[PDB]
């Protein structure tokens, strides 16, 4: 209930869950969805299907604020990130562009054991 | 003495005056350290590959000098003191290593 | 560093005769020069151990050329020392 139309869609994939946040031309979120927002509670939350559902839920809800065109921004890798980038393209919203902006350090903090054994 | 190459990138928003003033201090600074100005170039403004001091452009000054190496480090401490000075790279002049010729 | 000037100045100042570039006297002189600079650099930079080995060697090659001088001409020897000002 503002009527935006043009905006951004942040797809935050991960090996545990996917969460999409839609925003206005300059960052402030309009609506957000995830694997939890919808049914799924544990492992299920990750799965590409969930990512899909969540993507859609995100768009549908954003359709209300009158959204139409969006720029997609993918962050991270995980259980079905592409499905999300697809459910959007189909959701109805015209996807203006998909862009990987997954953060990466130029080597700063020692990661937790679980993510070390590398170099 | 050794022959060097001073590079200086300063704010691209200086007016005719403000600019010529910073150059003043430079030329002034150089002598203060023995910098014997062999020559100069002034490409002036250029679109930086990435922003410097938020500013996406830069004004360039190139001076090929001759001076007491024992002070080259100070010469640049001095040159960096300026607020409009947002880059200073002194380099030992080197024979132009050609290639593909 | 030691300029060509700084260098040749010592070379001519020690040479046994016009054009002498490798007389023991000269060599020892040049080494005494390098040593001192290094010993200097090292009075500061007490951590630059890597360079210190370089000194151990200079001092080495020198005390070894001098050893050769006595054996041969015991006079030029006492002469070189006094001059350069080696020992201590």
């Amino acid at each position: 209930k503002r009527q935006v139309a043009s905006g951004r869609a942040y797809i935050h994939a991960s090996y545990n869950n996917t969460i999409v946040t839609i925003t206005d031309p300059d960052g402030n979120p309009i609506t957000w969805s995830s694997g939890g927002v919808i049914g799924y509670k544990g492992s299920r939350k990750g799965t590409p299907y969930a990512a899909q559902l969540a993507a859609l839920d995100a768009a549908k809800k954003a359709m209300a604020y009158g959204m139409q065109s969006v720029d997609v921004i993918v962050r991270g890798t995980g259980a079905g990130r592409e499905q999300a980038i697809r459910a959007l393209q189909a959701s109805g919203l015209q996807v203006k562009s998909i862009v990987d902006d997954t953060p990466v350090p130029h080597n700063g903090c020692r990661p937790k054991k679980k993510f070390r054994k590398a170099s | 003495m050794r022959r060097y190459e001073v590079n200086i990138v300063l704010n691209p928003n200086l007016d005719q005056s403000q600019l010529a003033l910073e150059k003043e201090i430079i030329q002034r600074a150089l002598e203060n350290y023995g910098a014997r100005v062999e020559k100069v170039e002034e490409l002036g403004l250029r679109r930086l590959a990435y922003p410097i001091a938020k500013d996406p452009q830069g004004y360039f000054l190139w001076y090929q000098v001759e001076m007491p190496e024992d002070r080259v480090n100070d010469l640049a401490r001095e040159l960096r003191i300026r607020d409009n000075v947002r880059r200073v790279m002194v380099v030992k002049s080197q024979e132009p290593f050609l290639a593909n010729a | 560093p030691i300029t060509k000037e700084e260098k040749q100045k010592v070379i001519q100042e020690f040479a046994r005769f016009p054009g002498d570039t490798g007389s023991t006297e000269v060599q020892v002189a040049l080494l005494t020069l390098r040593i001192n600079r290094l010993s200097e650099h090292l009075k500061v930079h007490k951590k630059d151990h890597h360079s210190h080995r370089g000194l151990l060697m200079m001092v080495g090659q020198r005390r070894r050329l001098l050893r050769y001088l006595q054996r041969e001409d015991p006079e030029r020897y006492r002469a070189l020392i006094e001059k350069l000002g080696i020992r201590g």
């Binding site: 862009v99 | 590959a49 790279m89 024979e95 290639a99 593909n100 | -």
Partner: protein, 73 residues
């Protein structure tokens, strides 16, 4: 394969030591600020080794990038 064209051949006689020739230097960079391998720069071990310092010097001055974003994907 990497047999598209050696950046060296596709170019003139340049001073590999010159850290301001954004014009030519920019040629040895990937579709990102990355410095290309000899496989693609057609330079030699020695030449290629001098380029790096130059391309890096040029990066500090702000003339050359450190890294660029990838388009497509």
């Amino acid at each position: 394969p990497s047999r598209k064209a050696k950046v060296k051949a596709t170019l003139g006689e340049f001073d590999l030591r010159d850290y301001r020739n954004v014009e030519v230097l920019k040629r040895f960079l990937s579709e990102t600020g990355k410095i290309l391998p000899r496989r693609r720069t057609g330079l030699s071990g020695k030449e290629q080794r001098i380029l790096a310092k130059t391309i890096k010097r040029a990066r500090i001055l702000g003339l050359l990038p450190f890294t660029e974003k990838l388009v497509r994907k």
